[PDB]
Amino acid sequence: MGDRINTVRGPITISEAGFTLTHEHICGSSAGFLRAWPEFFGSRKALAEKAVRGLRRARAAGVRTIVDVSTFDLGRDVSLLAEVSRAADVHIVAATGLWLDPPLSMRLRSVEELTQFFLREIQYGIEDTGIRAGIIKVATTGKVTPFQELVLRAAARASLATGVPVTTHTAASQRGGEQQAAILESEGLSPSRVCIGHSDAADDLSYLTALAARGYLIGLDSIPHSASWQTRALLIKALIDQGYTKQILVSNDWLFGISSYVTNIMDVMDSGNPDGMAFIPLRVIPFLREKGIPQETLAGITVTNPARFLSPTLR
Amino acid sequence: GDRINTVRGPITISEAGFTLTHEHICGSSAGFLRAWPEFFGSRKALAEKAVRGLRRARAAGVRTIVDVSTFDLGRDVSLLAEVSRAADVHIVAATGLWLDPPLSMRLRSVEELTQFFLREIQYGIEDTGIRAGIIKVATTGKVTPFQELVLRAAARASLATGVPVTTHTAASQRGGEQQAAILESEGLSPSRVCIGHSDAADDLSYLTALAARGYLIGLDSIPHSAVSWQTRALLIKALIDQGYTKQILVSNDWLFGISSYVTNIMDVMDSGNPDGMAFIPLRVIPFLREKGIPQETLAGITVTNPARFLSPTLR
Numbered sequence A: 001m002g003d004r005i006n007t008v009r010g011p012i013t014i015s016e017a018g019f020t021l022t023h024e025h026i027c028g029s030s031a032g033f034l035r036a037w038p039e040f041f042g043s044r045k046a047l048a049e050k051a052v053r054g055l056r057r058a059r060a061a062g063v064r065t066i067v068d069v070s071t072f073d074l075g076r077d078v079s080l081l082a083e084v085s086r087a088a089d090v091h092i093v094a095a096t097g098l099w100l101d102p103p104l105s106m107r108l109r110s111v112e113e114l115t116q117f118f119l120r121e122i123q124y125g126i127e128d129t130g131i132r133a134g135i136i137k138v139a140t141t142g143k144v145t146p147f148q149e150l151v152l153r154a155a156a157r158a159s160l161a162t163g164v165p166v167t168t169h170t171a172a173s174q175r176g177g178e179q180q181a182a183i184l185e186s187e188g189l190s191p192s193r194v195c196i197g198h199s200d201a202a203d204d205l206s207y208l209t210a211l212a213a214r215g216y217l218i219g220l221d222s223i224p225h226s227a228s229w230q231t232r233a234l235l236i237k238a239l240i241d242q243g244y245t246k247q248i249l250v251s252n253d254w255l256f257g258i259s260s261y262v263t264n265i266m267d268v269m270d271s272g273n274p275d276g277m278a279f280i281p282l283r284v285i286p287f288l289r290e291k292g293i294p295q296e297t298l299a300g301i302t303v304t305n306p307a308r309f310l311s312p313t314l315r
Numbered sequence B: 001g002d003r004i005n006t007v008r009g010p011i012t013i014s015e016a017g018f019t020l021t022h023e024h025i026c027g028s029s030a031g032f033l034r035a036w037p038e039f040f041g042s043r044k045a046l047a048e049k050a051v052r053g054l055r056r057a058r059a060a061g062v063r064t065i066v067d068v069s070t071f072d073l074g075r076d077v078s079l080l081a082e083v084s085r086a087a088d089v090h091i092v093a094a095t096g097l098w099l100d101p102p103l104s105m106r107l108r109s110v111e112e113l114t115q116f117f118l119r120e121i122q123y124g125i126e127d128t129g130i131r132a133g134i135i136k137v138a139t140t141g142k143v144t145p146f147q148e149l150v151l152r153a154a155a156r157a158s159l160a161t162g163v164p165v166t167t168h169t170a171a172s173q174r175g176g177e178q179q180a181a182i183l184e185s186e187g188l189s190p191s192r193v194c195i196g197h198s199d200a201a202d203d204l205s206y207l208t209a210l211a212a213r214g215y216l217i218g219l220d221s222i223p224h225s226a227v228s229w230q231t232r233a234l235l236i237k238a239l240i241d242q243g244y245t246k247q248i249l250v251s252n253d254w255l256f257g258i259s260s261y262v263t264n265i266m267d268v269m270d271s272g273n274p275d276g277m278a279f280i281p282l283r284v285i286p287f288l289r290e291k292g293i294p295q296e297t298l299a300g301i302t303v304t305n306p307a308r309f310l311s312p313t314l315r
Ligand SMILES: C[As](C)(=O)[O-]
Pocket: A028, A169, A253
């Protein structure tokens, strides 16, 4: 809080975070799936070793902290997160919230009940681990459904109660952040607590600048998903040129295992981006400096902006 | 079949005794009990309630229950083993899939689902070494394409292990007929299959035609009408009078906690049926005796039929 954020190894001071990737995943899965069917990923051991190798390579490239925005329904296994964080010596911030696959036991809950679930994971711990979430992740479809609106209100109330930020999954093509922002502001949530994710898939700079002008963080968090990735990277330069350097968060949205998709999509992605989570420091950062963006600006985006974002702020 | 697998290890068929073939400790979602135990008061409170309820059923003669909670109903086999030990009631655990599969299950091929069911039967559930003794499948309507994949994977896992298949369907739609067609297309003998929720049938001829084909008929939700239950119970006598006593399985389809529905539904259900899982022995058995059914027939329904069904059989 304030001076410190929760990680899966415990609280760290904001200065320790360093180069932070604010939207990543160790595993994209489903609640209970890794523990019920680890051989889907070869084995749990095989999956953890893959994640440790990849995190160590991102660390070599300068990454010091990642935010795993896998929720309960993305199969978040915070014991796996802690194992790989410790072995890679990379800070991992865990998430609460709900993505696009809530089971019935979540889909039938009230906004008050969802609020208590998010407060439990932030304030008490996830499962029986004592590991606390440092961010609340919400996904909506283009047109926000009734249940998704409940999740956003619960996220806003939990963020207002704890100071931890909210990060969203959007369809940038449907300008979904505008619906999300309206709801979140209807609860009194400051835009400076909110990242509008998957924004690098947008064909509408005006949509991005208007949100940034309101104080939202712009998650250009899927750049290596292109990947033309050069065109998506230029959105970073575009927002810098308009005076919104401080509103930019950059990430890879990479994963080391995937079960919530057609089998073998992980291999396809690995042949496309062998850098994995190292893609931002190894490719995008030098691309931007080559375009004349000063080093101090890039340090602001990769260190200072996440630190201001992740630092529990306001109420 | 000699032995059947339970949550405390293998037992001999004679040890099973009076067996309720369709029950639940908890109706939930994958990962939910471990993520949000306070939804049930606490894990300890749910466990103590389940132990008291199973001890009640045991005092009324029950020696074994089949918990047909699947992965996606939030089956927690460690909870089942704890309550089974404390109540001294055998519990048989289930694999398969019910009506709430997450994305990581919905996107699997029939061959992949077959490997998952086989893992839970032949190796164990999660990391517990507890092996499933039945395969539970649910369908809706005329069966969806994915539900057909589950039925075929269930038949293949049954054919390789001898473990039986038990289904959820809508008797009002005669949904057992579509299930039977698919399972028979795979080569599975009807004597390995229980068509469940059949006591919701308004049509005796639908059940007779299935029984005459060799299916087990799951008259498994009698006290749900108590929330007329005697009318449902008469389907038991009707099938007895038609000569199909050998095809009858009876149960309560009760639960001690429920999160996959509206909040406090468990309170409504407990006030409607305070007998819980003892409803079958304390209400339905005496009712059938007063209607003239002899002891030998009732013992055949509650002991012999579940033994033959659960005994792993390929011959
Ligand atoms: C599985 As995704 C939209 O969060 O990268």
